[PDB]
Design an enzyme around this catalytic site. Structure first.
Site, PDB file in Angstrom:
ATOM      1  N   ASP A 167       0.845  -1.195   0.000  1.00 58.32           N
ATOM      2  CA  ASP A 167       0.000   0.000   0.000  1.00 58.32           C
ATOM      3  C   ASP A 167       0.886   1.253   0.000  1.00 58.32           C
ATOM      4  O   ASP A 167       1.921   1.291   0.666  1.00 58.32           O
ATOM      5  CB  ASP A 167      -0.910  -0.017   1.239  1.00 58.32           C
ATOM      6  N   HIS A 304     -10.394  -2.430  -6.945  1.00 57.75           N
ATOM      7  CA  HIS A 304     -10.190  -1.308  -6.037  1.00 57.75           C
ATOM      8  C   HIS A 304      -9.473  -0.126  -6.672  1.00 57.75           C
ATOM      9  O   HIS A 304      -9.993   0.989  -6.643  1.00 57.75           O
ATOM     10  CB  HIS A 304      -9.445  -1.775  -4.779  1.00 57.75           C
TER      11      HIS A 304
HETATM   12  C1  HEM Z   1      -9.022  -1.024   4.624  1.00 56.14           C
HETATM   13  C2  HEM Z   1      -9.373  -0.321   3.545  1.00 56.14           C
HETATM   14  C3  HEM Z   1      -8.430  -0.144   2.336  1.00 56.14           C
HETATM   15  C4  HEM Z   1      -7.407  -0.928   1.948  1.00 56.14           C
HETATM   16  C5  HEM Z   1      -6.917  -2.247   2.584  1.00 56.14           C
HETATM   17  C6  HEM Z   1      -6.816  -0.329   0.770  1.00 56.14           C
HETATM   18  C7  HEM Z   1      -5.743  -0.831   0.061  1.00 56.14           C
HETATM   19  C8  HEM Z   1      -5.177  -0.276  -1.064  1.00 56.14           C
HETATM   20  C9  HEM Z   1      -4.116  -0.864  -1.849  1.00 56.14           C
HETATM   21  C10 HEM Z   1      -3.427  -2.202  -1.519  1.00 56.14           C
HETATM   22  C11 HEM Z   1      -3.838  -0.030  -2.866  1.00 56.14           C
HETATM   23  C12 HEM Z   1      -2.810  -0.227  -4.003  1.00 56.14           C
HETATM   24  C13 HEM Z   1      -1.437   0.404  -3.759  1.00 56.14           C
HETATM   25  C14 HEM Z   1      -1.425   1.911  -3.867  1.00 56.14           C
HETATM   26  O1  HEM Z   1      -1.558   2.466  -4.979  1.00 56.14           O
HETATM   27  O2  HEM Z   1      -1.243   2.573  -2.808  1.00 56.14           O
HETATM   28  C15 HEM Z   1      -4.744   1.092  -2.761  1.00 56.14           C
HETATM   29  C16 HEM Z   1      -4.783   2.162  -3.612  1.00 56.14           C
HETATM   30  C17 HEM Z   1      -5.645   3.221  -3.526  1.00 56.14           C
HETATM   31  N1  HEM Z   1      -6.698   3.342  -2.633  1.00 56.14           N
HETATM   32 FE1  HEM Z   1      -7.161   2.036  -1.128  1.00 56.14          FE
HETATM   33  N2  HEM Z   1      -7.526   0.821   0.445  1.00 56.14           N
HETATM   34  C18 HEM Z   1      -8.495   0.972   1.416  1.00 56.14           C
HETATM   35  C19 HEM Z   1      -9.430   1.977   1.445  1.00 56.14           C
HETATM   36  C20 HEM Z   1      -9.516   3.013   0.550  1.00 56.14           C
HETATM   37  C21 HEM Z   1     -10.539   4.041   0.540  1.00 56.14           C
HETATM   38  C22 HEM Z   1     -11.690   4.125   1.560  1.00 56.14           C
HETATM   39  C23 HEM Z   1     -10.282   4.874  -0.481  1.00 56.14           C
HETATM   40  C24 HEM Z   1     -11.058   6.142  -0.927  1.00 56.14           C
HETATM   41  C25 HEM Z   1     -12.395   6.208  -0.867  1.00 56.14           C
HETATM   42  C26 HEM Z   1      -9.084   4.394  -1.135  1.00 56.14           C
HETATM   43  C27 HEM Z   1      -8.470   5.006  -2.199  1.00 56.14           C
HETATM   44  C28 HEM Z   1      -7.358   4.548  -2.858  1.00 56.14           C
HETATM   45  C29 HEM Z   1      -6.690   5.285  -3.902  1.00 56.14           C
HETATM   46  C30 HEM Z   1      -7.022   6.664  -4.494  1.00 56.14           C
HETATM   47  C31 HEM Z   1      -5.564   4.404  -4.345  1.00 56.14           C
HETATM   48  C32 HEM Z   1      -4.575   4.750  -5.469  1.00 56.14           C
HETATM   49  C33 HEM Z   1      -5.253   4.411  -6.793  1.00 56.14           C
HETATM   50  C34 HEM Z   1      -4.380   4.759  -7.968  1.00 56.14           C
HETATM   51  O3  HEM Z   1      -3.889   5.907  -8.051  1.00 56.14           O
HETATM   52  O4  HEM Z   1      -4.181   3.865  -8.834  1.00 56.14           O
HETATM   53  N3  HEM Z   1      -8.671   3.243  -0.511  1.00 56.14           N
HETATM   54  N4  HEM Z   1      -5.554   0.895  -1.672  1.00 56.14           N
END
Ligand code: HEM
Ligand SMILES: *[C@@H]1O[C@H](CO)[C@@H](O)[C@H](O)[C@H]1NC(C)=O
Ligand SMILES: COc1cccc(OC)c1O
Ligand SMILES: COc1cccc(OC)c1O
Length: 438
Positions: A167, A304
């Protein structure tokens, strides 16, 4: 040029510390709080400039500070900041996000919380030392209503969240300062993140320049349940061939996220993990879905990362909906006996932090307009469905997870439970003393 010495560092650079504590407080005495704040800020509040300095010149802990609407009111700071959601607080917005309100807990169930100190450090004992320093400096001018503490996961899981996925790979880059920009990284005007800067369209008091809004979310994660679900629904095969159950379960997890646990994006590595790619910041973000706009073999429409940043699904670069994240996992590792049982026995999850100038365009847009919307991304040959990780609409049905049977729908139990959250404003460092403490 951005004044890096005046911007709270977690907003632009990110603390990237192994341990972090969020100290939520109420103000008891405005006058006493304000003088304590004037003492505290020059000593402890860490700028973006410090975060990009040599680690030798860095303090043992970084501290940032945000205020809720009721916190600003308690301090007699009554100028409208121009955000539609900040004034009412997150509890009042929680149903809109899709939250089961019965899972929310004190002290987030109202607008009691006035602010949060974010303390980033290397060890829990250091968090304690810096928390005690807050107690000593502020004394009875505040009441600490809750502290939530997190920690990076151990060993090769460092940087991974509790489901096992790396992440903090993809972040926007703002113009107005000199930094390294990776292939595939969005470059946006600074006002997408910083209030009052070019790209911000909200009506801001002048003192709000170079601040940002934080969406904080306390998520509990159900890791044994997630693991068991992926095993029970393991993808039997992909383009490259048949998968063992373990392979098919790992693949299903990657299909749900849009990245393998290593960080390798499935748009580039659609059939097997490529750990070298996952660990390569020069390539792990260099994709835009342009090779998979009208089919789901390479990536589901509802994964996601594709839901939260649609890239070319929007038709081209769009500044408006990018946001910075500085989340940290919390809680113990998931034991072998827990995984075997398929049932959570310990509290673990994510202390989620997302910064943007306009709450409604960052966190909230990603959550409501995108993740919760079965019909987003638009103009697809198969309904995308609900984002399986954090989408909240019921039924939680998502399509396309099996690349060889894309019309198959999966109804996914919720593995991420919101336990509380708040909307905060983090002022500039000068505004902390010149305005908030005036
Ligand atoms: C426990 C809850 C969550 C987990 C385990 C999680 C996990 C992750 C993971 C593994 C990534 C991919 C690596 C990265 O680009 O950083 C990611 C990307 C991302 N997540 Fe989450 N996330 C969670 C909740 C959220 C929420 C609630 C939002 C917004 C409403 C969010 C928004 C994003 C965004 C904007 C990215 C980058 C997407 C991109 O630029 O390609 N995440 N998340
Ligand atoms: C692949 O899996 C199917 C069952 O899904 C099986 O019939 C087949 O023999 C396996 N191997 C190959 C090489 O097709
Ligand atoms: C490769 O990165 C991108 C490409 C097109 C649009 C994006 O954000 C909307 C984006 O982040
Ligand atoms: C070839 O791509 C498509 C075919 C049929 C319908 C589509 O979206 C409505 C679509 O995007």
């Amino acid at each position: 040029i951005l004044p890096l010495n005046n911007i709270q560092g977690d907003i632009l650079v990110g603390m990237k510390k192994q341990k972090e504590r969020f100290v939520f407080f109420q103000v008891n005495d405005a006058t006493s709080f304000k003088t304590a704040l004037k003492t505290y800020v020059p000593e402890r509040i860490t700028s973006a400039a410090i975060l990009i300095s040599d680690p030798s010149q860095q303090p043992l802990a970084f501290v940032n500070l945000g205020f809720s609407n009721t916190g600003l009111q308690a301090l007699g700071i009554t100028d409208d900041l121009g955000d539609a959601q900040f004034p009412d607080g997150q509890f009042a917005d929680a149903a809109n996000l899709g939250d089961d309100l019965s899972q929310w807990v004190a002290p987030f169930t109202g607008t009691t919380i006035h602010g949060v100190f974010l303390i980033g450090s290397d060890q829990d004992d250091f968090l304690d030392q810096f928390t005690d320093d807050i107690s000593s400096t502020f004394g009875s001018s505040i009441t600490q209503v809750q502290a939530l503490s997190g920690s990076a996961r151990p060993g090769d899981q460092a940087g991974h969240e509790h489901f096992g996925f790396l992440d903090g790979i993809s972040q926007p880059s703002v113009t107005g300062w000199e930094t390294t920009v990776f292939p595939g990284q969005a470059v946006v005007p600074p006002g997408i993140i910083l209030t009052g800067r070019d790209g911000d369209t909200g009506t801001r008091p002048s003192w709000a320049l170079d601040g940002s809004f934080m969406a904080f979310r306390h998520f509990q994660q159900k890791v044994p349940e997630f693991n068991a679900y992926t095993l029970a629904n393991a993808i039997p095969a992909n383009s490259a061939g048949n998968l063992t159950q373990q392979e098919g379960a790992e693949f299903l997890g990657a299909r749900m996220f849009g990245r393998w646990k290593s960080g390798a994006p499935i748009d580039l590595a659609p059939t097997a993990d490529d750990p070298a790619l996952g660990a390569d910041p020069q390539r792990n973000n260099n994709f835009d879905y342009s090779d998979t706009l009208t089919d789901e073999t390479r990536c589901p429409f509802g994964a996601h990362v594709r839901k939260t940043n649609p890239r070319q699904d929007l038709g081209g670069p769009v500044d408006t909906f990018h946001a910075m994240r500085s989340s940290i996992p919390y809680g113990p590792e998931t034991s072998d006996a827990e995984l075997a049982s398929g049932v959570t026995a310990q509290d673990r999850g994510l202390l989620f932090v997302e910064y943007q100038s306009i709450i409604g365009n960052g966190f909230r847009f990603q959550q409501i307009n995108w993740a919760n919307n079965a019909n987003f991304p638009f103009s697809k040959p198969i309904t995308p469905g609900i984002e399986p990780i954090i989408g909240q609409t019921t039924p939680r049905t998502v399509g396309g997870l099996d690349p060889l049977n894309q019309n198959e729908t999966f109804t996914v139990p919720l593995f991420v439970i919101p336990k509380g959250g708040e909307y905060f404003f983090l002022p500039s460092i000068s505004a902390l003393t010149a305005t908030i403490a005036a």
